Amino acid sequence: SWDKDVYPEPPSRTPAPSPQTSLPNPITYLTKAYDLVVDWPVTLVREFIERQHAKNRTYYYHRQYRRVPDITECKEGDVLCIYEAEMQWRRDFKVDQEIMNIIQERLKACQQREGENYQQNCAKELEQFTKVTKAYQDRYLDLGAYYSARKCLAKQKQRMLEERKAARQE
């Protein structure tokens, strides 16, 4: 299973078979024999396993990371507070890599299924990619290899100033 909201998937619409030839579809036969000889024995092996995994049911949790003071709340030089603001940002920055991948999975998953209509029926997924990319580029692009929170902050302040100077004229 998986969450169908994280990974949206249009319902399948298979036309019902319309066989108007006298001959037998050889696909539909090896599909029966495949179910009896391959699918059926395997499902027993899996049902056996999941009855063991039910007897030894174990649990694990997603770790919670409360929020710590931002970098903006750190006096210059106080490495004790910079360190925690830096660790948090690195955690945040990493979750943003995986958000981008998820948005990319959708766009790739849509391109395949729409097939010859991707130029039309993949607009919404291409729009989220185009939007979530602009945000990503506005946060993390050009930081460099030694990227950190302080550089992320410096890049934002330099951009908030270049836009304030847009209206200071207009």
Added chain:
Amino acid sequence: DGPEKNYEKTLAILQIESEKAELRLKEQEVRRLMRARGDGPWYQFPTPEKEFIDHSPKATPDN
């Protein structure tokens, strides 16, 4: 162990390394002032021992 230990040790290390860094910069500022002004316990340079001045009455009065 959990992440706590490595995290809070790294906090403990960073504090030690940070306090040391400020002491080292403070010693240079201190040594610069004591040496140039001679008003501190360091860089005291010798002056003649006054205990060997002869305080007795002399053969002459004007002394």
